Amino acid sequence: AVAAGA
């Protein structure tokens, strides 16, 4: 699980 952002 990879999440990038805001």
From Swiss-Prot:
Organism field: Oryza sativa subsp. japonica (Rice)
Induction: Repressed by abscisic acid (ABA) and drought stress.
Expression across tissues: Expressed in leaf sheaths and leaf blades. Expressed at low levels in roots, flowers and seeds.
Protein name: Abscisic acid receptor PYL5
Locations listed in the record: Nucleus; Cytoplasm, Cytosol
Purpose of the protein: Intracellular abscisic acid (ABA) receptor that functions as a positive regulator of ABA signaling pathway. Together with ABI5, PP2C30 and SAPK2, is part of an ABA signaling unit that modulates seed germination and early seedling growth. Acts as a positive regulator of abiotic stress-responsive gene expression. Inhibits the protein phosphatases PP2C06 and PP2C09 when activated by ABA.
Known partners and oligomeric status: Monomer. Interacts with PP2C30. Binding to PP2C30 is dependent on the presence of abscisic acid (ABA). Interacts with PP2C51. Binding to PP2C51 is dependent on the presence of ABA. Interacts with PP2C50. Binding to PP2C50 is dependent on the presence of ABA. Interacts with PP2C53.
Range within the parent protein: 24 to 29 of 209
Note: Plants overexpressing PYL5 exhibit abscisic acid (ABA) hypersensitive phenotypes. Plants overexpressing PYL5 exhibit tolerance to salt and drought stresses, but are hypersensitive to osmotic stress and ABA during vegetative growth.
